[PDB]
Design a protein around this ligand. Sequence first.
Ligand SMILES: Nc1ncnc2c1ncn2[C@@H]1O[C@H](COP(=O)(O)OP(=O)(O)O)[C@@H](O)[C@H]1O
Ligand SMILES: Nc1ncnc2c1ncn2[C@@H]1O[C@H](COP(=O)(O)OP(=O)(O)O)[C@@H](O)[C@H]1O
Ligand SMILES: Nc1ncnc2c1ncn2[C@@H]1O[C@H](COP(=O)(O)OP(=O)(O)O)[C@@H](O)[C@H]1O
Ligand SMILES: Nc1ncnc2c1ncn2[C@@H]1O[C@H](COP(=O)(O)OP(=O)(O)O)[C@@H](O)[C@H]1O
Ligand SMILES: [Mg+2]
Ligand SMILES: [Mg+2]
Ligand SMILES: [Mg+2]
Ligand SMILES: [Mg+2]
Lengths: 433, 430, 146, 22, 434, 443
Amino acid sequence: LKSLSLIAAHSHITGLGLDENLQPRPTSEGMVGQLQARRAAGVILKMVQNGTIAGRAVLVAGPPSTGKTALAMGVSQSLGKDVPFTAIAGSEIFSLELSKTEALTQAFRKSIGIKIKEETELIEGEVVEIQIDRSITGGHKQGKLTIKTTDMETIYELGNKMIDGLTKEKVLAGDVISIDKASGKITKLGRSFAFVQCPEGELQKRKTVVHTVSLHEIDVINSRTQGFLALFTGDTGEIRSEVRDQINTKVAEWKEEGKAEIVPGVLFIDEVHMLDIECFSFINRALEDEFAPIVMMATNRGVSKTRGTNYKSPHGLPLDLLDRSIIITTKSYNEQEIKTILSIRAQEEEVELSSDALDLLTKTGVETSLRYSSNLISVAQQIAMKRKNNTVEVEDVKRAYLLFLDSARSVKYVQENESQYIDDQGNVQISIA
Amino acid sequence: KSLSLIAAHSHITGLGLDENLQPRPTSEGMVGQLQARRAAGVILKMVQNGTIAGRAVLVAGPPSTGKTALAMGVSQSLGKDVPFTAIAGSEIFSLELSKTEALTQAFRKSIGIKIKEETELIEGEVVEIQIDRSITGGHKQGKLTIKTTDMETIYELGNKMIDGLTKEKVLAGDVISIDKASGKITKLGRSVQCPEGELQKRKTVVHTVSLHEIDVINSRTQGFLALFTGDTGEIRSEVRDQINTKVAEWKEEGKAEIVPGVLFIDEVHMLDIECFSFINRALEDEFAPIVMMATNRGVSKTRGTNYKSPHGLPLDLLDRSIIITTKSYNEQEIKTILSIRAQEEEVELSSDALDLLTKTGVETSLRYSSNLISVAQQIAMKRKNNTVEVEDVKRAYLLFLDSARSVKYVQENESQYIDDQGNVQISIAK
Amino acid sequence: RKIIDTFAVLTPSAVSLDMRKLALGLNDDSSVGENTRLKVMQNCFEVSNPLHQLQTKLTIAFPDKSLLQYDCGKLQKLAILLQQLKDNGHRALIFTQMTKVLDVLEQFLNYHGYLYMRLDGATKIEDRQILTERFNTDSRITVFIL
Amino acid sequence: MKALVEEIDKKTYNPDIYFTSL
Amino acid sequence: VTRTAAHTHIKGLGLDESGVAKRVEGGFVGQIEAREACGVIVDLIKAKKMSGRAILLAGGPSTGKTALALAISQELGPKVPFCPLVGSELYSVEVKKTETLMENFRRAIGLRIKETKEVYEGEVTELTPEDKTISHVIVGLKSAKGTKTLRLDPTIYESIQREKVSIGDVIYIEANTGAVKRVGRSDAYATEFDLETEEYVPLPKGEVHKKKEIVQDVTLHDLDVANARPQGGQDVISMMGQLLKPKKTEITEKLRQEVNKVVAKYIDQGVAELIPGVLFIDEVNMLDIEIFTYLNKALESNIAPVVVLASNRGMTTVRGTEDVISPHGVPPDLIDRLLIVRTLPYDKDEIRTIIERRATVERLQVESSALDLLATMGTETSLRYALQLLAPCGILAQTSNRKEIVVNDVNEAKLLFLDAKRSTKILETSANYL
Amino acid sequence: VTRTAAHTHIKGLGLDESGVAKRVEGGFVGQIEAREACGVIVDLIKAKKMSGRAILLAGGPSTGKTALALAISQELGPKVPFCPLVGSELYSVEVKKTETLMENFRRAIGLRIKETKEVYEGEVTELTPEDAENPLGGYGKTISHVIVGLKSAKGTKTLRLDPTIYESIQREKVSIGDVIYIEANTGAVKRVGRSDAYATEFDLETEEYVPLPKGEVHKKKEIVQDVTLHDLDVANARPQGGQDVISMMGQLLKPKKTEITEKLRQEVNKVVAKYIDQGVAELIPGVLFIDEVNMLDIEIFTYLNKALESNIAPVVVLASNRGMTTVRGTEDVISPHGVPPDLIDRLLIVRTLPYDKDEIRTIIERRATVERLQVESSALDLLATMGTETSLRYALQLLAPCGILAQTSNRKEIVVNDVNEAKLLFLDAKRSTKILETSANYL
Ligand SMILES: Nc1ncnc2c1ncn2[C@@H]1O[C@H](COP(=O)(O)OP(=O)(O)O)[C@@H](O)[C@H]1O
Ligand SMILES: Nc1ncnc2c1ncn2[C@@H]1O[C@H](COP(=O)(O)OP(=O)(O)O)[C@@H](O)[C@H]1O
Ligand SMILES: Nc1ncnc2c1ncn2[C@@H]1O[C@H](COP(=O)(O)OP(=O)(O)O)[C@@H](O)[C@H]1O
Ligand SMILES: Nc1ncnc2c1ncn2[C@@H]1O[C@H](COP(=O)(O)OP(=O)(O)O)[C@@H](O)[C@H]1O
Ligand SMILES: [Mg+2]
Ligand SMILES: [Mg+2]
Ligand SMILES: [Mg+2]
Ligand SMILES: [Mg+2]
């Protein structure tokens, strides 16, 4: 809530949309079709919410336009809060100043999270009067405060830290403040009549405090003194394995202690069809690690030459990954399913579509691609408002189609437009004669 | 009291030559290679000759033939106080240090310099300590009687010495050593130590050092910790020129004298052509140590070039260097070396088992038997017998497969493992 | 501050004393000026830092007060059983044989933050009636120690 | 070397005094 | 509750006192020669006299190589320093690779030490320069029965005054390290302020001075990095030195010489002791020929402890080479110094046994017929595929509100999951690289 | 005692006053053309009028390119600056090679500077500031300017001293009665130690008790020290150091090397021109010598194409030993000695020559004299022969083993048996490759 979410291709989807028996509905919670894909996503969701097992990774593949990252975003938002989810681009790991392997280790460690619980006490009430006893030279200030609520009205002496805090900020006796004795923080809630705060109930309460923390930040702050600034800036790396396994043992004994509970998150890695065999071997090893969070791995390339090896590795991946990784495959969408997805998008972005206009938009999306339809349904809004009506007509979308080209038709055009452009050598005819 | 364990070279302690450069067939653990040991004596006479410099010698041969053992034996024959440096060809390849200045530093560290300095030491047992002073004005006048076997002398101590004596807690019966120039104090025992002789003992302190340390010190005020941690790099050559001139004048006036060191480089076949040229040009240096090459690789393509130079090295390097090789070992050499392993690592192998191990070493390799004799110890003591029999040797042979046996095993099991393309069959059916 | 003091546990098990002084080169014998070291020591004395919290957490592993009951397995179940007992709304009678476990029990109970009061040989003669009546009567006290 | 923490008294001890006998 | 990933089913190698590998022990099946060779390594490292030998595991996928590494690590015990490693991570971007190799070799060597620290605690009654004064401060610690005054170094007093201690503050101060830390204020001053953020704690019990022996273990690498660069400090110059260089640097040969000399002196003193370690490096075929030719010398070292390797390839070209094709991608020069332990694959019965054992540790119950199924399709595809599908089958049984995995469960699991073979097959019929 | 490393046998070209090179002179036998050309190059550099010229020396190995370079360096003299350089030395890691080669170019030329300073000595008795009896209404009379009567036995003067020189006095922690040494301009303070008068005060003292050096208080000395240009370059770019804390921090800031901008160089050039107009300094040219140039990157060749265009470029002599070789850093750019033609357009080619049997005999006997080792005629003939058919270098390398074999036989002369045994125990490249042809496993 209260967070920015602009119009995006993954904003419309909200949750997986599948029953308690994990049979998805044909159109529910943002997705249309891909029933087997959605039920597999629910399978992964129950895997991650169980949390008993670790070291699980999956392959989602197929041609483009199959909603792979759509399903990834759906399962991520189904995870929602109370669980960390990390999405990392495959090409992002390539760094020249940061070691690839330990950066990958900290990428895994970011997914793993630790929740620590503690109970703190606090006093809340309406301030009554402000009185202090200090000296101009000798200091030794002795402040006193009268606090009140709906039932209790009492006076307390104000210690040196509290009087310093009360002086450091402009305070009014009509203000309502909350103080935690252990930490000494001052929480100025509101003000009395000059003015929103109206305290009630017990004067002093005790409440629990929970910190959602990932193992990665423990590791970086405990690696060295400058770990704090490295975390807040990103200029870290090459963390020694000694602190690594020491913190691993510490969190293991804390988990068996019951003081704090671990939450093994989900890691998302993308377009790994372009990557290194170093990465493949290291993740092959790391999947067997005891502290291995569930890893989501996505790809789009079929058989191709894996970078770092001469041979064309099948599926763009080495066989060792395929030995330990389970595959999830997604099919295409029918014309009716594409129309339903377009209707869902239109409802999300609130543009009126004519029935014939929407039908021809669907047929031309099936003809060319659905990304083309996604951008056409956006430009149709401005085409329709330039004629001063939110409804999008057939002429709006046809004007958009004749205005913007598709990839295939532009390819054919440059086939008839070869001479006007340089070749791979660089030969062009800028002239006309 | 050096910390030493069993190793592939810990058995040999010295080459074992004669006055006329005649190698005893079994000397100081070094056996065989009569010509190689005579060349070792020749390079010995080179290094303790000291009057020659800029000499490069090449030692080559088949793998596992003990050329590294020859170098280790040579180093043992040199003994202490002679600066010897042993390194491979991979340490130089670094990113914080480029190859050229790394090789320059490798040359520089080789040669050492002897520095002879006289020191004044005062060592004797104390009788009592009495420091005069002011309660708030200072005015410290420390006095303490120093005794030994033949004097009982009171000494008035200056401000620095009594400030130190306040820094380190000492008592009357404690004995301390005093040096006039430094003013430092060293106490070791209590009436534990029995001092004797004169208090004003005038003994010298002699310090040896390579010119690398003084170069690093003069390069930078942080050079102390830089050499203590190795994070140096790219020292200006004008510093090298001035330090070379300074040590030259030191040599003429004789306060300090140089000790030409010995450099050992291994796996030169993987060295770069730029490094080869740097060696070729730096050999002409007057401060060029005696360096031997250890190339275990024969005809191969020199790194950085597409040309398959002989011995893996360009002929330009070979022209200004001499080459000697090493030969194989007849079965009696294997017998002798495995006997030395048995005595060194304390193996009471059976005579028939000794012959079987000799055969297995001869047909397969020397190091295979060198490890089999080690594993036979536990293969025997698991049944609680100190001696090792033939069945233990056969058990070790069958348990730990050989390189050729593994090669054959994978030749009919190519599909069991991945290929150059990487494909592998995991299913056991169809 | 809270997170940096709750997640700083390790220590550099090995360190070389007086190497910090030679890291900058300041010591009794050095090539730098005689009072250069004095001046840098003095200004470092006046120069302030906010990182000293991490410095004292890393240099020495302070035995935080939390581990009083994390080192006691009995206390691990004791905390949860008192939690469920107060959730049900019941008082308890607890008995031991040695007063040292009573002592550690009172420190633990003050740590968890309860109003309570103990009875043993150290108690005077007069307070026995008041403790008996306060526990017998309906009061906020729920744990009574013997 | 010198111990960082050393025994210090108030009656017999004084910063200026340093006497050690048999 | 319990967490596992393809391991933790190993509680040991599972041998006897005579060295014979039991057919089923410690959750192990088969590999009797491999288990006996692992026991040979066990009583090699228990002798702790051998140094500089290399033993690698030759096996394909699912051959139990890293499983055997887990077994040897488990039987080694916490005292024995075991350092698992990956042949791909040795490539370093800030320091040379051979430096990292020597660093991990030095990490492998561990050594127990015994030491005694001096502990001082109490409440400080005076913080005054001695008197005509210098940057020294007398501090008087008051314990329950301890009453002493201490004069301290300028640096430790600087750390004290940066701790914001005062009179009435109980502190914990050490004499050897000199680290400063205030416990809090005495309970006698709790009544002085009705409210205070600062917490009041009782006066320390006992006498101010304390002694205790410490038997903490330390690897030689930790000592080398301790004397190579400073580690901690509460005075400003300590942070000055730390921030002067945070970059990790190599270690000079003479530094190794002096550290081994000093530890030799300490072990000669009769307190220090030495224990070798075991280095396990995953897929040693992944690293380059440079590391191979450096290890050609590194193996011949003296203090270099026992190292165990593994590979998953055969007659393959060596990295960094063109015509140098070698078994396991390892050049012949190193394999002459290498010893190999042969591994064997698994057939139907042992595959079924390992699956049911890890299901027992998985806390999942499988019916006999479903066991027959998982034995069946766990062979024509892989054992690892059935190993992965074990958990989804149990969860599908759970969704059906049944506690027994049935043949139907594995049926839908294999229907809605496809293996590598099926992925390749459906890739064969591709319109646009499906 | 006497150390020789393939050199010290040559004492320069040693040409005649007419420039003709005699047959045998200064470790050189024959080789008239190259020696005469080198003497012509010496005449070029001694002209002190021309700059930017360069020359490359060409030919097969073992012909004495290093010998000729060392000869010209020796005859130029230590006063004339010289900067040796190897091709592999250029490739650095901190800064790009252009900065390094400009650094060497500046290092080539030098400049001697005339300077005069003032000398002071004597023992210390007074540590008092200016009394300043007049308050003037602005001074609570006191100053950080300690007036010291410089008590030398021959003179005494009271000096108003700067706070820096008095701070350095405090650094020495001087007391009453100890010799001091101060400078008028820099104010450098060094003490030989406490006087011998206070020696009897302390039975022991770390401070050394020294007598007062003889001489007047105020003494004036002049120096004409020669300092190369790039030492001043680095000093101007980075201050060298100082005893003060501010200088300590300043030199702690940036001690690593980086590029050098031309503006400071031009300002230094202008102030040096002002000095030479004043006559304070006089410039001297420089020589830069580069080793094994065939490996240089094409970028280095392109930059050196314009480096000589600069007016500050001194004479740079070059050596190469290649034929039809492709330029390193290129693919199809092949040329003699592996150098692009654009560079060699402005260069001058000089070629060395091989030698006849008598020349090998002469160089062998000259070497034998260099290592004071006496040889027989038959052994001399065998060495000369095998040097002709194998190489000069192999014979030079095995010269010492022959003497060692003679010595271990208690013989002071090398015999036929000595060289035969040396050939038994050592093999050249030819039989090395002959043996390695018939190799079981690359023997
Ligand atoms: N079932 C679905 N519900 C909603 N949107 C979908 C669905 N399937 C596909 N999409 C759309 O298709 C796009 C898929 O893009 P992405 O998953 O990043 O890669 P690819 O185009 O290869 O599948 C998403 O932006 C999503 O909006
Ligand atoms: N003459 C010998 N005396 C003793 N040991 C020998 C001898 N020859 C070979 N060895 C042993 O054989 C091993 C060969 O190892 P190494 O020298 O590294 O291989 P290479 O000879 O290929 O360099 C050495 O460790 C050495 O212990
Ligand atoms: N003897 C055995 N008993 C039980 N499980 C085994 C045995 N041997 C191998 N495994 C299993 O086979 C899997 C493969 O082992 P591992 O060495 O990790 O991979 P690889 O054999 O491919 O190197 C492991 O997860 C392990 O649980
Ligand atoms: N004409 C010559 N007269 C005397 N010595 C010579 C002559 N030519 C070569 N040399 C010898 O060659 C050695 C140097 O060889 P060098 O010039 O480095 O070989 P390259 O020709 O490959 O540069 C010197 O020690 C020198 O004695
Ligand atoms: Mg996608
Ligand atoms: Mg070898
Ligand atoms: Mg494995
Ligand atoms: Mg030459």
